[PDB]
Design a protein around this ligand. Structure first.
Ligand SMILES: *CCC(=O)Nc1ccc(NC(=O)c2ccc(C)c(C#Cc3cnc4cccnn34)c2)cc1C(F)(F)F
Length: 282
C-alpha cells in the first residue's frame, strides 16, 4: 500500500535502541508524518549492511503483516514506512518507557511509584493485545516481557524486535538445532513437537505473568536449559509463586501452564478474569 509511504528526507535517525546481527531499531524524529503532530518522536526498524537477502525479505513481509493487522491500543502503532529508492524503514510511534523488563527492574526497589494495580493493568492490557493478535490469526511465538513496550499513560504495547535482537548472545535464547529459541518461555508442544498456536502463546503469557509479578525475574532462576530442564517440564514441573503475585494471579499462571494446550484459557477469557481482580467496573 502506498498510503504508508513516507519520504526519507522527512526522517531523522538517532541512537540505536536495540540491534541484532543484521537488524536494528533506532530512535528518530518524523516531520510531516501527522498533520496534527508535525514533529513526532518515532522508532525505526532497519537492516544493517551485514544483512543478506533472506533478512531483507523478512523485513518487507513484516511490514506487510503489520499493515494488515490494523491498529490496536495494545500493539505497537505502525505509522509509516520507507520502501522506494532505498533500504526498508518501518516507522513506529515511540514508546516512552521502553521495554517492560527494564521498566520493572528500574521500579522494583520502590515497589509499594509502582503498585500491584499497575502490574494487574499490564497483565490485563497484554491479554487484550494478545486477544487482538489471535483474532487476526497472528501467533506471536516470542511473547515475553522483553517484547512488551510501555507508552506514556502506562499503556502496554506488544512488539517483536525480531532481527533487532541479538538472539545469539542473549541468555534468554538457547541454541537448539539451527537457531536460538526462547525455551524458558515456550510451551512443551513447541519445544519438543514444534507446534506453535495461540495456545502456545497462552503458555508464554503465563511465563510473562511470572516475569511481571517477580518484577522482572528470569524464569526458572538458576536452572540452565539442559536435558534436566527439558525432562522436568515434561514431568509437570512449574515455577513457584513470585513474591508479588496474589493467589488469584498465581492460579491464572498455572492454568496457562496446563500440559494439554486445549485446557489453557483463551486470551479473551484471561482478560475477563484479570478484569475482575481490578478495582472498579466499567
Ligand atoms: C503475527 C505475528 C506478528 O506480526 N509479530 C510481530 C512482528 C513484528 C513486529 N514489529 C515490531 O514490533 C516493531 C517494528 C519496528 C519498530 C521500530 C518497533 C519499535 C519500537 C520502539 C518504540 N519505542 C521504543 C523504545 C525503546 C525500544 N524500542 N522502541 C517495533 C510486531 C509484531 C507483533 F507481535 F506486534 F504483531
Amino acid at each position: 500500500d502506498s498510503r504508508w509511504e513516507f519520504p526519507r528526507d522527512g526522517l531523522v535517525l538517532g541512537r540505536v535502541l536495540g540491534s541484532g546481527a543484521f537488524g536494528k531499531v533506532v530512535e528518530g524524529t518524523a516531520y510531516g508524518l501527522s498533520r496534527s503532530q508535525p514533529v513526532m518522536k518515532v522508532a525505526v526498524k532497519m537492516l544493517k549492511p551485514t544483512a543478506r537477502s533472506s533478512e531483507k525479505q523478512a523485513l518487507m513481509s513484516e511490514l506487510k503483516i503489520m499493515t494488515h493487522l490494523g491498529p490496536h491500543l495494545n500493539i505497537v502503532n505502525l505509522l509509516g514506512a520507507c520502501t522506494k529508492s532505498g533500504p526498508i524503514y518501518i516507522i513506529i510511534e515511540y514508546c516512552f518507557y521502553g521495554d517492560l523488563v527494564n521498566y520493572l527492574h528500574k521500579n522494583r526497589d520502590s515497589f509499594l511509584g509502582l503498585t500491584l494495580l499497575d502490574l494487574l493493568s499490564f497483565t490485563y492490557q497484554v491479554a487484550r493485545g494478545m486477544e487482538f493478535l489471535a483474532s487476526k490469526n497472528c501467533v506471536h511465538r516470542d511473547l515475553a516481557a522483553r517484547n512488551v513496550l510501555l507508552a506514556q499513560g502506562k499503556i502496554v504495547k506488544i512488539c517483536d524486535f525480531g532481527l533487532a535482537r541479538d538472539i545469539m548472545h542473549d541468555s534468554n535464547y538457547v541454541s537448539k538445532g539451527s537457531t536460538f529459541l526462547p525455551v524458558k518461555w515456550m510451551a512443551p508442544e513447541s519445544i519438543f513437537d514444534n507446534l506453535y498456536t495461540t495456545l502456545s502463546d497462552v503458555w508464554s503469557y503465563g511465563i510473562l505473568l511470572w516475569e511481571i509479578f517477580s518484577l522482572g525475574g528470569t524464569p526458572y532462576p538458576g536452572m540452565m536449559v539442559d536435558s534436566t530442564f527439558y525432562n522436568k517440564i515434561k514431568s509437570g514441573y512449574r515455577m513457584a509463586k513470585p513474591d508479588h503475585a496474589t493467589s488469584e494471579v498465581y492460579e491464572i499462571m498455572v492454568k496457562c501452564w496446563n500440559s494439554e494446550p486445549e485446557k489453557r484459557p483463551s486470551f479473551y477469557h484471561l482478560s475477563e478474569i484479570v478484569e475482575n481482580l481490578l478495582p472498579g467496573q466499567y
